[PDB]
Amino acid sequence: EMTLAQLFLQSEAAYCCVSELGELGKVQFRDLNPDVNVFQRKFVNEVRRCEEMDRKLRFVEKEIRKANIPIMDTGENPEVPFPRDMIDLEANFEKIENELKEINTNQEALKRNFLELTELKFILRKTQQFFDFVAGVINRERIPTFERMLWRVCRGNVFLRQAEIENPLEDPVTGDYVHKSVFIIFFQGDQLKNRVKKICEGFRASLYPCPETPQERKEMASGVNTRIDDLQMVLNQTEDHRQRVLQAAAKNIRVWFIKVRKMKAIYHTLNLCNIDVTQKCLIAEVWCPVTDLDSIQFALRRGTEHSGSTVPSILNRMQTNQTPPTYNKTNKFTYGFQNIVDAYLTFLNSFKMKMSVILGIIHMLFGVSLSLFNHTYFFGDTMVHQAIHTIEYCLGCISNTASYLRLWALSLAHAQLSEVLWTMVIHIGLKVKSLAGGLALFFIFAAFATLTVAILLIMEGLSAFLHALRLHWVEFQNKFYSGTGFKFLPFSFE
Amino acid sequence: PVHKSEKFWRENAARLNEKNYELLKILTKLLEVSDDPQVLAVAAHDVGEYVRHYPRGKRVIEQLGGKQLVMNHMHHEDQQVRYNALLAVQKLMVHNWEY
Amino acid sequence: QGIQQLLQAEKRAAEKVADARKRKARRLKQAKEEAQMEVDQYRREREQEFQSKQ
Amino acid sequence: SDADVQKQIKHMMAFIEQEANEKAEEIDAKAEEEFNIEKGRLVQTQRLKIMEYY
């Protein structure tokens, strides 16, 4: 019982009315300008601004989990932010966006700076110990095959120094947490420098310039000492600057979702306005219940006050020839049971067959009588149509009433296997002479506990439940229900 | 707006070095000597923009010793001054020449 | 309906901004002939110093 | 309630006159730069030729 009754807007009340109208959830905004593309719907530039904040929110919800920060919820339907507050949000949203995008690129360059200088620092101690040209670093696992190749292709020789570094360091992707070793490539020749650099890249060694003169090694060792600890200082100082704004974001992102997601939803309905015609006032052609005409109108009177507009909006009524979408009670323990139908030995044999056949005739009687009350509620092609209407009811009810005979025969299937199941429970387990009461009854009663429910209640139960849907759909909904249907779909919250 | 403009820092990169480079240290002398809880925040971001637009100015900043001054100013009690010094000191060691 | 009383209403808003684009397009030529009244008038403004120097 | 057709004539006609008056009054008060300034242009042309006979 819906009406396409018109509703007018004034574009100073186009947000605050619709938002409180979208804070109720009884409205079915219908697009009546279909002759237009997906762009130029009056607000395409601003719905991308909500989408840009949506892209920033889907990005910031990912990085808030990689640092593993607990998320505040405080679950409540909030106030929808005004377009006055919208420009103030992109100052705040992009501040968190640009700072966190910069830091993850800056900390990775700082971490790459930290590991390289510590790798250079550990070779300064071990070589100045050995002293009292190429210097470089290689892992311990590749050092015996390196000097075997270094003796091979250089083949004069280079006097190699072998000295293993202490507790494992890590270059970021290669290698992850390995203890390496230093080496010394003097050779004095300056021709074999080309013949060793290919080997240093082939074994993936990391080489650094050493000053090579005495007391400048300790001079640069004092230099990289002060450089590393300052680099160690700013690395954690970026990290405590990081976590202090992650938890500042952790108090934000949950409510900041439903700020813009409610804004993006109502602006999509602002795209769904009438035809964008000729003045600074709007119309809305919505579907609405007659039982809720008053409550949405007082809500419309509430919406024009929240913007502070002096002029209330109106509601015209009319009549047309279109779909009257359905609406009902929609109760909680009535929600799931409604959604299923919205998707669309010798003596017992003689007695239970005919009484079930009359029961199917009684179910068809109540169904066909509902067609007369539905018809009362509102030549050549009429002959061939009503012939298909009548004789498909004639031979059709026979196949319906034949499928009512199964629900006794499925109970005969229910009775026979339950005795066999029962027989095992009463006979193979309990009729053992010596070792019955312990291990023998325990595995059989477990079969009486677990194996009967999968066979009699799971598969036999679902099949008769699927049969009962077939008794409802093709055998009961074929008598009165036209089966066309059209849902209401109110403008929801989440 | 000139201190936040990207065109101002990119075009006037060598303008500090062409002006007898101690004039860039005159910005550092104002940053090191004076406290200035709002005015040194402009001194921190302008020093990092000079280092970002000139990697050789990091040697000039190490010559004037402003890196230890920016490090000590990073521990200031002001929030915006410590936040600006954190972005500047991290930009000061971004290039990482060998010592 | 309500749109039918509104369509003639917007044309009443449309005409009152239309003629304002017209009387402002008439007066600009009229200013060129009202500031050309000065040649009929400031020949007499020259006549006081024509009489003062005489 | 049949006053919805009257509420259209009540306050949607008020949106007609506010765009009728306060947009044309912005045009009508633009004579300080389209009638006074344009008069100030042509008086210099009269003072260009009065500074020969004076």
XYZ file of C-alpha atoms in Angstrom:
701
model
C 0.000 0.000 0.000
C 2.560 2.552 -1.185
C 2.215 5.912 -2.918
C 4.602 7.735 -5.260
C 3.404 11.017 -3.612
C 5.756 13.903 -4.417
C 8.006 15.677 -1.930
C 9.585 19.091 -2.465
C 12.963 20.430 -1.315
C 14.544 23.885 -1.367
C 18.350 23.234 -1.578
C 19.058 25.077 1.652
C 17.174 22.180 3.180
C 18.573 19.470 0.931
C 21.101 18.005 3.375
C 19.650 18.435 6.863
C 16.152 17.330 5.852
C 17.326 14.263 3.897
C 19.833 13.283 6.601
C 17.160 13.270 9.305
C 14.929 11.636 6.692
C 17.742 9.111 6.340
C 17.897 8.955 10.129
C 14.391 7.431 10.070
C 14.557 4.795 7.330
C 11.121 4.570 5.701
C 11.802 6.205 2.335
C 12.172 4.770 -1.194
C 13.742 7.522 -3.344
C 13.058 6.708 -7.007
C 15.180 8.001 -9.876
C 12.989 9.685 -12.496
C 15.754 11.044 -14.720
C 17.086 7.834 -16.322
C 18.210 9.625 -19.504
C 21.546 10.757 -18.031
C 25.002 9.242 -17.575
C 26.623 8.210 -14.278
C 28.426 11.574 -14.137
C 26.701 15.091 -14.134
C 24.305 14.060 -11.338
C 24.707 17.556 -9.766
C 27.165 16.329 -7.098
C 29.801 14.184 -8.865
C 32.624 16.459 -7.735
C 31.630 16.191 -4.077
C 30.824 12.466 -3.958
C 34.375 11.882 -5.136
C 35.453 14.062 -2.208
C 33.651 11.621 0.068
C 35.188 8.834 -2.022
C 38.647 10.379 -1.618
C 38.102 10.340 2.141
C 36.769 6.804 1.686
C 39.987 5.892 -0.156
C 41.952 7.501 2.667
C 39.916 5.607 5.264
C 40.293 2.233 3.539
C 44.031 2.931 3.388
C 44.386 4.081 6.996
C 42.424 1.074 8.277
C 45.027 -1.172 6.656
C 48.116 0.496 8.137
C 46.503 0.661 11.586
C 46.510 -3.146 11.644
C 50.081 -3.664 10.403
C 51.353 -1.831 13.477
C 48.809 -3.936 15.455
C 47.024 -1.179 17.396
C 43.820 -1.935 19.356
C 40.772 -0.196 17.920
C 38.230 1.743 19.974
C 34.646 1.016 18.964
C 32.118 2.808 21.249
C 29.300 1.579 19.046
C 26.578 4.182 18.505
C 24.804 5.801 15.560
C 26.439 9.240 15.434
C 25.424 12.610 14.094
C 25.894 12.974 10.342
C 28.472 15.700 9.561
C 27.258 18.810 7.762
C 28.866 20.192 4.581
C 30.020 23.060 6.808
C 32.059 20.489 8.726
C 33.088 18.676 5.533
C 35.784 21.146 4.441
C 37.156 21.072 7.990
C 37.425 17.264 7.772
C 39.726 17.192 4.734
C 42.115 19.425 6.656
C 42.116 16.810 9.421
C 41.884 13.655 7.286
C 44.733 14.598 4.942
C 46.916 15.671 7.882
C 46.860 12.076 9.131
C 47.124 10.845 5.536
C 50.153 12.892 4.473
C 52.044 12.388 7.741
C 51.659 8.606 7.734
C 52.449 8.271 4.018
C 55.622 10.320 4.484
C 56.802 8.508 7.629
C 56.603 4.961 6.230
C 58.746 6.093 3.305
C 60.995 8.112 5.627
C 61.419 5.404 8.278
C 62.253 2.838 5.594
C 64.915 5.185 4.231
C 66.054 5.794 7.810
C 66.174 2.064 8.582
C 68.164 1.537 5.369
C 70.402 4.350 6.628
C 70.727 2.695 10.043
C 71.735 -0.785 8.889
C 74.230 0.464 6.281
C 76.140 2.604 8.772
C 76.283 -0.199 11.343
C 77.530 -2.571 8.639
C 80.258 -0.049 7.820
C 81.075 0.435 11.507
C 81.794 -3.219 12.303
C 84.421 -3.507 9.567
C 86.357 -0.571 11.013
C 87.167 -2.370 14.271
C 88.168 -5.728 12.793
C 90.445 -4.338 10.077
C 92.187 -1.861 12.393
C 92.787 -4.816 14.710
C 94.356 -6.771 11.846
C 96.311 -3.722 10.657
C 97.847 -3.281 14.114
C 92.005 -2.039 -2.428
C 88.484 -3.261 -1.615
C 86.891 -3.736 1.804
C 83.550 -5.451 2.100
C 81.089 -7.702 3.894
C 79.857 -11.217 3.071
C 77.778 -13.759 4.984
C 79.385 -16.731 6.732
C 77.503 -19.341 4.670
C 79.093 -18.185 1.391
C 82.673 -17.414 2.516
C 84.361 -20.866 1.798
C 83.081 -21.051 -1.786
C 83.935 -17.368 -2.271
C 87.662 -17.785 -1.600
C 87.663 -20.946 -3.726
C 86.417 -18.869 -6.656
C 88.621 -15.914 -5.665
C 91.727 -18.110 -5.817
C 90.505 -19.497 -9.153
C 89.916 -16.532 -11.487
C 92.253 -13.943 -9.949
C 94.863 -16.737 -9.838
C 97.895 -14.696 -8.897
C 96.440 -14.263 -5.437
C 94.777 -11.733 -3.159
C 95.760 -12.106 0.487
C 92.318 -12.626 1.989
C 91.551 -11.819 5.617
C 88.908 -13.993 7.258
C 87.186 -12.537 10.319
C 83.602 -13.202 11.423
C 81.413 -10.413 12.772
C 79.382 -10.887 15.985
C 75.588 -11.026 16.670
C 73.415 -10.983 13.520
C 72.673 -7.839 11.530
C 70.073 -7.392 8.827
C 70.003 -5.673 5.454
C 66.264 -5.214 4.729
C 65.436 -7.774 2.041
C 68.837 -9.521 1.694
C 69.743 -10.759 4.106
C 67.225 -11.070 6.941
C 69.036 -11.443 10.290
C 72.319 -13.172 9.405
C 75.789 -12.878 10.985
C 78.241 -11.884 8.248
C 82.020 -11.652 7.821
C 84.505 -9.010 6.654
C 87.244 -9.386 4.040
C 90.300 -7.528 2.728
C 91.170 -7.208 -0.990
C 94.419 -5.158 -1.023
C 96.293 -6.832 -3.988
C 98.200 -3.569 -4.874
C 97.861 -4.240 -8.613
C 94.963 -2.010 -9.808
C 94.175 -4.310 -12.744
C 92.577 -7.185 -10.833
C 90.079 -4.661 -9.395
C 87.878 -5.435 -12.409
C 88.385 -9.187 -11.911
C 87.240 -9.068 -8.263
C 84.258 -6.714 -8.628
C 82.455 -9.273 -10.791
C 83.089 -11.871 -8.072
C 81.894 -9.466 -5.369
C 78.586 -8.997 -7.195
C 78.349 -12.676 -8.132
C 78.536 -13.745 -4.490
C 76.406 -10.675 -3.553
C 78.912 -9.003 -1.225
C 78.358 -5.515 0.185
C 81.455 -3.321 -0.036
C 82.235 0.004 1.667
C 85.134 2.474 1.265
C 87.781 2.324 3.992
C 90.136 5.298 4.507
C 93.153 2.881 4.339
C 95.477 5.213 6.248
C 96.350 4.877 9.960
C 94.507 7.001 12.568
C 91.979 8.150 9.976
C 90.267 4.789 10.473
C 89.729 5.648 14.142
C 88.865 9.206 13.086
C 85.988 8.006 10.914
C 85.120 5.408 13.568
C 84.476 8.284 15.974
C 82.494 9.992 13.219
C 80.190 7.070 12.487
C 79.809 6.508 16.241
C 78.195 9.919 16.707
C 76.267 9.514 13.449
C 74.710 6.163 14.402
C 73.523 7.152 17.891
C 71.904 10.284 16.476
C 70.381 8.025 13.819
C 69.373 5.640 16.612
C 67.810 8.586 18.454
C 65.675 9.891 15.584
C 64.611 6.367 14.564
C 62.782 5.722 17.833
C 61.730 9.386 17.974
C 59.974 8.828 14.666
C 58.523 5.673 16.219
C 57.141 7.362 19.328
C 55.817 10.054 16.996
C 54.275 7.186 15.028
C 52.494 5.356 17.862
C 51.185 8.572 19.428
C 49.170 9.300 16.285
C 48.152 5.685 15.669
C 46.319 5.660 19.003
C 45.069 9.141 18.144
C 43.740 7.541 14.963
C 42.508 4.514 16.947
C 40.078 6.809 18.760
C 38.931 8.184 15.402
C 38.652 5.730 12.501
C 35.673 3.756 13.846
C 33.403 6.794 14.148
C 35.077 8.468 11.140
C 33.817 5.589 8.978
C 30.133 6.180 9.679
C 30.517 9.946 9.379
C 31.444 9.862 5.690
C 29.652 6.578 4.882
C 26.404 8.195 5.982
C 27.419 11.273 3.977
C 28.264 9.226 0.875
C 24.937 7.408 1.158
C 22.764 10.532 1.357
C 24.771 12.275 -1.369
C 24.104 9.270 -3.594
C 20.426 9.998 -2.962
C 21.174 13.653 -3.711
C 22.215 12.294 -7.095
C 18.845 10.519 -7.122
C 16.916 13.821 -7.015
C 14.219 14.684 -9.527
C 15.557 16.088 -12.829
C 17.823 18.984 -11.645
C 15.462 21.525 -13.183
C 15.485 25.277 -13.597
C 15.548 26.645 -10.016
C 17.237 26.360 -6.596
C 14.499 24.019 -5.279
C 14.211 20.250 -5.617
C 11.488 17.599 -5.875
C 11.603 13.987 -4.675
C 9.345 11.182 -5.947
C 9.527 8.598 -3.188
C 7.509 5.527 -2.265
C 5.952 5.809 1.165
C 3.499 3.923 3.405
C 0.086 5.384 4.144
C 0.534 4.324 7.790
C 3.743 6.398 7.923
C 2.671 9.512 5.972
C 2.370 11.575 9.154
C 5.621 10.460 10.797
C 7.787 11.244 7.770
C 6.093 14.640 7.455
C 6.852 15.631 11.045
C 10.370 14.355 10.365
C 10.393 16.588 7.285
C 9.261 19.411 9.569
C 12.105 18.412 11.893
C 14.649 18.463 9.076
C 14.045 22.049 7.965
C 14.670 23.284 11.520
C 18.029 21.517 11.872
C 19.482 23.530 8.996
C 17.918 26.677 10.440
C 15.879 27.297 7.289
C 12.785 29.466 7.732
C 10.682 27.668 5.091
C 9.267 24.164 5.698
C 9.123 21.566 2.940
C 5.871 20.151 1.567
C 4.475 16.795 0.405
C 2.187 16.555 -2.635
C 0.009 13.489 -3.221
C -0.835 11.903 -6.576
C -1.697 8.641 -8.337
C -0.103 6.715 -11.208
C 0.183 3.247 -12.762
C 3.389 1.615 -11.496
C 4.568 -0.993 -8.994
C 3.022 -0.954 -5.497
C 5.971 -2.453 -3.523
C 5.120 -4.675 -0.561
C 5.581 -3.854 3.113
C 4.627 -5.785 6.257
C 5.434 -6.396 9.952
C 9.015 -7.715 9.501
C 9.208 -9.165 13.045
C 12.416 -10.704 14.495
C 11.380 -14.354 14.893
C 9.324 -13.740 11.776
C 12.187 -12.427 9.643
C 13.861 -15.700 8.683
C 10.597 -17.590 8.265
C 9.306 -14.970 5.822
C 12.501 -14.741 3.752
C 12.222 -18.381 2.644
C 8.841 -17.903 0.957
C 9.997 -14.544 -0.421
C 12.706 -16.467 -2.300
C 10.001 -17.970 -4.512
C 2.032 -52.841 7.793
C -0.682 -53.358 5.182
C -3.376 -51.622 7.254
C -1.305 -48.442 7.622
C -0.894 -48.254 3.838
C -4.622 -48.154 3.083
C -5.574 -45.591 5.731
C -2.762 -43.028 5.711
C -2.782 -42.653 1.920
C -6.397 -41.474 1.501
C -6.464 -39.182 4.550
C -3.305 -37.440 3.341
C -4.863 -37.166 -0.125
C -7.906 -35.429 1.373
C -5.540 -33.252 3.410
C -3.864 -32.159 0.190
C -7.327 -31.546 -1.248
C -8.099 -29.444 1.829
C -4.867 -27.485 1.373
C -5.759 -26.902 -2.277
C -9.266 -25.854 -1.210
C -7.979 -23.123 1.109
C -5.549 -22.001 -1.594
C -8.047 -21.824 -4.448
C -10.534 -19.978 -2.222
C -7.901 -17.294 -1.612
C -7.841 -16.636 -5.367
C -11.501 -15.589 -5.318
C -10.932 -13.130 -2.465
C -7.878 -11.777 -4.297
C -9.902 -11.388 -7.499
C -12.632 -9.628 -5.511
C -10.013 -7.308 -3.973
C -9.542 -5.548 -7.327
C -11.956 -13.643 -26.873
C -9.568 -15.703 -28.985
C -6.544 -15.147 -26.759
C -8.726 -15.529 -23.657
C -9.664 -19.064 -24.717
C -6.126 -20.392 -25.215
C -4.880 -18.677 -22.051
C -7.632 -19.980 -19.769
C -7.223 -23.448 -21.276
C -3.608 -23.374 -20.070
C -4.870 -21.897 -16.793
C -7.456 -24.624 -16.174
C -6.041 -27.941 -17.387
C -2.611 -27.312 -15.848
C -4.595 -26.997 -12.629
C -6.398 -30.231 -13.558
C -3.445 -32.549 -14.200
C -1.295 -30.412 -11.907
C -3.141 -31.114 -8.656
C -2.782 -34.850 -9.307
C 1.007 -34.508 -9.194
C 0.590 -32.283 -6.136
C -1.599 -34.780 -4.263
C 0.703 -37.614 -5.319
C 3.536 -35.699 -3.647
C 1.459 -35.533 -0.472
C 1.666 -39.327 -0.273
C 5.420 -39.175 0.375
C 5.149 -37.678 3.869
C 3.745 -40.941 5.176
C 6.141 -43.013 3.057
C 9.115 -40.935 4.210
C 7.946 -41.717 7.738
C 8.017 -45.365 6.673
C 11.608 -44.697 5.630
C 12.021 -42.990 9.016
C 10.609 -46.024 10.837
C 12.648 -48.777 9.182
C 16.169 -47.346 9.438
C 15.518 -46.233 13.030
C 14.910 -49.876 13.925
C 18.071 -50.949 12.196
C 19.939 -48.151 13.941
C 18.070 -49.137 17.028
C 18.897 -52.802 16.349
C 22.610 -52.095 16.412
C 22.206 -50.103 19.623
C 20.203 -52.891 21.268
C 21.948 -55.919 19.782
C 25.502 -55.889 18.575
C 26.877 -53.837 21.454
C 24.835 -54.961 24.445
C 24.670 -58.702 23.589
C 28.355 -59.431 24.167
C 28.935 -62.066 26.837
C 32.207 -61.098 28.536
C 33.617 -57.707 27.532
C 30.416 -55.707 27.016
C 30.026 -52.963 29.630
C 33.284 -51.144 28.916
C 34.799 -50.541 25.489
C 32.075 -52.389 23.570
C 29.070 -50.324 24.699
C 31.076 -47.090 24.602
C 31.778 -47.071 20.854
C 28.255 -48.273 20.024
C 26.495 -45.703 22.232
C 28.735 -43.087 20.605
C 27.369 -44.368 17.294
C 23.939 -44.083 18.913
C 24.890 -40.517 19.849
C 26.689 -39.188 16.756
C 25.965 -41.431 13.775
C 22.157 -41.305 13.983
C 21.844 -37.514 13.860
C 23.768 -37.179 10.591
C 21.549 -39.792 8.912
C 18.056 -39.348 10.360
C 18.060 -35.674 11.333
C 20.599 -34.018 9.023
C 19.946 -35.517 5.587
C 16.464 -36.950 6.123
C 15.540 -33.782 8.015
C 16.764 -31.355 5.349
C 15.175 -33.337 2.509
C 11.702 -33.284 4.065
C 12.300 -29.611 4.879
C 13.172 -29.119 1.207
C 10.122 -31.224 0.376
C 7.982 -29.023 2.642
C 9.190 -25.998 0.693
C 8.093 -27.805 -2.473
C 4.729 -28.505 -0.831
C 4.570 -24.761 -0.154
C 6.068 -23.358 -3.369
C 4.811 -25.438 -6.291
C 1.872 -27.016 -4.447
C 0.470 -24.171 -2.281
C 1.735 -20.870 -3.726
C 0.462 -21.877 -7.184
C -3.179 -21.286 -6.240
C -3.372 -17.643 -5.121
C 0.098 -16.080 -5.365
C 0.865 -14.357 -8.671
C 4.581 -14.586 -7.885
C 5.555 -11.262 -9.457
C 6.617 -9.301 -6.366
C 8.581 -6.112 -5.723
C 10.414 -5.312 -2.497
C 10.329 -2.047 -0.565
C 14.072 -1.480 0.184
C 13.967 1.487 2.603
C 16.855 3.949 2.843
C 18.765 2.280 5.664
C 21.520 3.240 8.121
C 24.363 0.743 7.677
C 53.040 31.062 2.671
C 56.579 31.204 1.255
C 57.858 28.858 3.971
C 55.272 26.237 2.999
C 55.441 26.763 -0.774
C 57.234 24.092 -2.794
C 58.052 26.587 -5.557
C 59.845 28.864 -3.081
C 62.152 26.123 -1.808
C 62.831 24.619 -5.249
C 63.663 27.876 -7.060
C 65.614 29.538 -4.236
C 67.792 26.485 -3.591
C 71.209 28.066 -4.193
C 69.945 31.481 -3.087
C 71.292 30.715 0.390
C 74.675 29.708 -1.036
C 74.894 32.674 -3.425
C 74.349 35.052 -0.485
C 77.694 34.358 1.308
C 76.453 31.090 2.852
C 76.707 32.287 6.491
C 73.424 34.082 5.674
C 71.900 30.601 5.737
C 73.744 30.167 9.037
C 72.188 33.478 10.088
C 68.925 31.535 10.004
C 70.758 28.906 12.054
C 72.203 31.531 14.414
C 68.667 32.779 15.029
C 67.569 29.170 15.579
C 70.424 28.233 17.921
C 70.622 31.333 20.121
C 66.953 32.319 20.472
C 64.334 30.062 22.022
C 61.264 31.330 20.068
C 58.594 28.612 20.597
C 56.690 29.670 17.461
C 59.388 31.412 15.395
C 61.939 28.580 15.571
C 59.289 26.270 14.107
C 59.631 28.243 10.873
C 63.403 27.971 11.297
C 63.232 24.175 11.475
C 61.114 23.671 8.347
C 63.145 26.171 6.313
C 66.394 24.433 7.267
C 65.086 21.047 6.137
C 63.850 22.490 2.849
C 67.365 23.801 2.223
C 68.768 20.328 2.903
C 66.093 18.716 0.725
C 66.811 21.048 -2.207
C 70.603 20.949 -1.701
C 72.429 17.815 -0.521
C 75.709 19.748 -0.344
C 74.103 22.037 2.242
C 74.208 19.113 4.673
C 77.982 19.555 4.676
C 77.365 23.284 5.156
C 75.007 22.486 8.034
C 77.648 20.157 9.481
C 80.169 22.976 9.045
C 77.951 25.340 11.046
C 77.036 22.526 13.446
C 73.290 23.082 13.165
C 72.554 19.347 13.272
C 73.485 19.124 16.954
C 71.487 22.318 17.498
C 68.446 20.811 15.767
C 68.912 17.593 17.763
C 68.935 19.492 21.057
C 65.947 21.550 19.897
C 64.090 18.306 19.156
C 63.864 17.700 22.914
C 62.009 21.012 23.434
C 58.807 20.993 25.485
C 56.770 22.562 22.676
C 54.726 20.154 20.574
C 54.881 21.914 17.201
C 58.565 22.758 17.660
C 59.467 19.127 18.377
C 57.298 17.931 15.479
C 58.975 20.344 13.062
C 62.445 19.432 14.345
C 61.658 15.727 13.908
C 60.871 16.248 10.223
C 63.988 18.397 9.814
C 66.511 16.157 11.593
C 65.241 13.093 9.722
C 65.645 15.053 6.480
C 69.148 16.051 7.602
C 70.359 12.427 7.561
C 68.338 11.340 4.505
C 71.257 11.404 2.058
C 73.907 9.755 4.306
C 77.311 10.460 2.794
C 80.203 8.477 4.248
C 81.787 10.079 7.302
C -0.133 20.198 -9.313
C 2.398 21.955 -7.109
C 4.845 21.955 -10.018
C 2.334 23.794 -12.213
C 2.029 26.711 -9.792
C 5.839 26.638 -9.486
C 6.672 26.710 -13.221
C 4.941 30.048 -13.807
C 6.456 31.248 -10.523
C 10.040 30.636 -11.664
C 9.348 32.535 -14.896
C 8.306 35.451 -12.683
C 11.693 35.125 -10.988
C 13.270 34.777 -14.434
C 11.808 37.984 -15.868
C 12.809 40.193 -12.924
C 16.451 39.263 -13.413
C 15.991 39.549 -17.192
C 15.004 43.226 -17.345
C 17.705 44.076 -14.793
C 20.137 42.758 -17.413
C 18.372 45.123 -19.837
C 18.086 48.398 -17.892
C 21.743 47.987 -16.946
C 22.418 47.512 -20.678
C 20.456 50.683 -21.514
C 21.890 53.039 -18.888
C 25.504 52.371 -19.934
C 24.855 54.008 -23.307
C 22.826 56.652 -21.456
C 25.857 57.417 -19.280
C 27.843 58.117 -22.453
C 25.298 60.798 -23.380
C 24.917 62.076 -19.804
C 28.683 62.539 -19.492
C 28.477 64.207 -22.920
C 26.261 66.848 -21.312
C 29.476 68.346 -19.898
C 30.501 69.848 -23.250
C 27.200 71.756 -23.167
C 27.942 72.796 -19.583
C 31.688 73.132 -19.008
C 32.045 75.653 -21.796
C 30.393 77.842 -19.153
C 32.904 76.523 -16.602
C 35.538 77.991 -18.921
C 33.547 81.238 -19.013
C 34.280 82.249 -15.411
C 38.042 82.325 -16.013
C 37.287 83.870 -19.396
C 35.666 86.644 -17.353
C 38.200 86.602 -14.506
C 41.202 87.119 -16.785
C 39.324 89.725 -18.843
C -4.970 18.780 4.935
C -5.585 20.678 1.696
C -3.243 23.537 2.694
C -0.278 21.974 0.853
C -1.337 23.801 -2.310
C -1.608 26.983 -0.216
C 1.773 26.318 1.431
C 3.199 26.316 -2.097
C 1.741 29.797 -2.662
C 2.686 30.755 0.917
C 6.459 30.323 0.909
C 7.665 29.120 -2.501
C 6.524 32.494 -3.837
C 8.765 34.037 -1.179
C 11.729 32.397 -2.918
C 10.582 34.107 -6.120
C 10.739 37.642 -4.730
C 14.041 37.215 -2.871
C 15.721 36.309 -6.155
C 13.671 39.025 -7.859
C 14.648 41.837 -5.488
C 18.005 40.984 -3.913
C 19.595 39.904 -7.194
C 18.355 42.948 -9.121
C 19.270 45.244 -6.220
C 22.812 43.899 -6.569
C 22.512 44.934 -10.217
C 20.751 48.237 -9.448
C 23.409 49.217 -6.899
C 26.159 48.465 -9.454
C 25.812 52.021 -10.772
C 28.681 53.090 -8.509
C 31.036 51.333 -10.946
C 28.964 51.313 -14.151
C 27.433 54.811 -14.030
C 29.713 56.862 -11.765
C 33.005 55.409 -13.037
C 31.926 55.522 -16.691
C 30.940 59.157 -16.147
C 34.427 59.666 -14.718
C 35.948 58.438 -17.978
C 34.315 60.923 -20.340
C 34.814 64.009 -18.158
C 38.552 63.535 -18.683
C 37.823 63.743 -22.414
C 36.114 67.076 -21.754
C 39.028 68.166 -19.564
C 41.439 67.054 -22.294
C 40.052 69.700 -24.658
C 39.355 72.399 -22.062
C 43.105 72.484 -21.352
C 43.793 74.249 -24.618
C 41.288 77.136 -24.560
C 41.906 77.874 -20.887
